[PDB]
Ligand binder design. Structure first.
Ligand SMILES: Cc1cc(C(=O)N(C(C)C)C2CC2)no1
Length: 150
């Protein structure tokens, strides 16, 4: 009973979370997952400030109100070569990665590793945070509050 959560650097408190190496998070699960990191889904303004500090990914993820990809450099296979916060307009499907916002993180680029999941609750799952440098933090718990996300 295991969940892998790949996380990034934080930029103005904003970071990306990919679950189990595939698009697999619902919007309800995303809010709960960010809450386990004492975080919330970013607002569009928070995401734009993070972009300005150096944040970009090549993955769709929830923010408050939309699913987006922050882009700095144009790349044909990432958000159709767009720059800025690219907003997903048309999709059949509901599951993506998520972004999260932690207000207590440093104001600009923070590329230290994540070493805690501070607000998960009691449960049976081995949750492993996987940093980009491969370092891992694991703890037994749960973060999903909606049964249909389990
Ligand atoms: C202590 C401490 C802080 C971190 C860290 O990188 N975090 C990021 C994801 C905002 C916070 C939620 C735990 N890891 O350990």
């Amino acid at each position: 009973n295991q969940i892998d959560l790949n996380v990034t650097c934080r930029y103005a408190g904003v970071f990306h979370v990919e679950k189990n190496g595939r698009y697999s998070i619902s919007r309800t699960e995303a809010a709960d997952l960010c809450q386990a990191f004492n975080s919330t889904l970013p607002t569009m303004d928070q995401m734009k400030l993070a972009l300005s500090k150096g944040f970009e990914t090549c993955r769709y993820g929830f923010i408050e109100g939309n699913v987006v990809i922050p882009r700095i450099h144009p790349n044909a296979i990432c958000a159709a070569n767009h720059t800025g916060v690219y907003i997903l307009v048309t999709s059949n499907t509901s599951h993506y990665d998520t972004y999260c916002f932690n207000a207590s993180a440093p104001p600009e680029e923070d590329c230290t590793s994540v070493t805690d999941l501070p607000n998960s609750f009691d449960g049976p799952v081995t949750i492993t945070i996987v940093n980009r440098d491969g370092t891992r933090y694991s703890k037994k718990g749960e973060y999903r509050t909606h049964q249909e996300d389990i």
